């Protein structure tokens, strides 16, 4: 069985929740707290940034779609090896006015949520096993 430590500043934060969930889905066990930390790798969640901008506009110059970009920086600490930085970047667009959208879309609430899932998915995918040492970038 795989294990690791999650260092979350806010365990209630959407990113943490997202990563935790992701980890469980990929069968990585979280350890409660710190002991044998010289044994298990830990994932530490760093900077997250979310940007929003007009992705497209109508003939009238007004905004049609928005583009959101979510950036997540983390580090993996494998005992005995160096801090291993990783990151995820998620792009997402949506129509400001749903009536202008051909397809049904979720709330902007869920849209941001979904980005957290995708970012966490990404971060999980980049996690080395016990068996490696990788170089940046």
Swiss-Prot record:
Ranges that cross the membrane: none
Compartment annotation: Cell outer membrane
GO biological process, alphabetically ordered: Gram-negative-bacterium-type cell outer membrane assembly; lipopolysaccharide transport
Cellular component GO terms, alphabetical: cell outer membrane; transporter complex
Bilayer topology annotation: Lipid-anchor
MF annotations from Gene Ontology: lipopolysaccharide binding
Chief location category: membrane
UniProtKB keywords: Cell outer membrane, Lipoprotein, Membrane, Palmitate, Signal
Stated family: Belongs to the LptE lipoprotein family.
Functional summary from the UniProt entry: Together with LptD, is involved in the assembly of lipopolysaccharide (LPS) at the surface of the outer membrane. Required for the proper assembly of LptD. Binds LPS and may serve as the LPS recognition site at the outer membrane.
Quaternary structure (record): Component of the lipopolysaccharide transport and assembly complex. Interacts with LptD. May interact with LptD during its assembly by the beta-barrel assembly machine (BAM). Directly contacts LptD at a wide range of positions, encompassing multiple surfaces of LptE. In one specific interaction, LptE contacts a predicted extracellular loop of LptD through the lumen of the beta-barrel. This specific interaction is required for proper folding of LptD and assembly of the complex. Also interacts with LptM, which promotes the efficient assembly of the LptDE translocon by the BAM complex.
Listed name of the protein: LPS-assembly lipoprotein LptE
Organism of derivation: Escherichia coli (strain K12)
Gene: lptE
Part of the full-length chain shown: 33 to 169 of 193
């Amino acid at each position: 069985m795989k294990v690791m430590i999650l260092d979350s500043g806010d365990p209630n934060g959407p990113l943490s929740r997202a990563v935790r969930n992701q980890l469980r889905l990929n069968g990585v066990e979280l350890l409660d707290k710190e002991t044998t930390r010289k044994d298990v790798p830990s994932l530490r969640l760093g900077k997250v940034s979310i940007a929003k901008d007009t992705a497209s506009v109508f003939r009238n110059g007004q905004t049609a779609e928005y583009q959101m970009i979510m950036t997540v920086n983390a580090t993996v600490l494998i005992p005995g090896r160096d801090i291993y930085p990783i990151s995820a970047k998620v792009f997402r667009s949506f129509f400001d006015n749903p009536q202008m959208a051909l397809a049904k879309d979720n709330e902007q609430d869920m849209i941001v949520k979904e980005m957290y899932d995708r970012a966490a998915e990404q971060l999980i995918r980049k996690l080395p096993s016990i068996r490696a040492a990788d170089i940046r970038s």
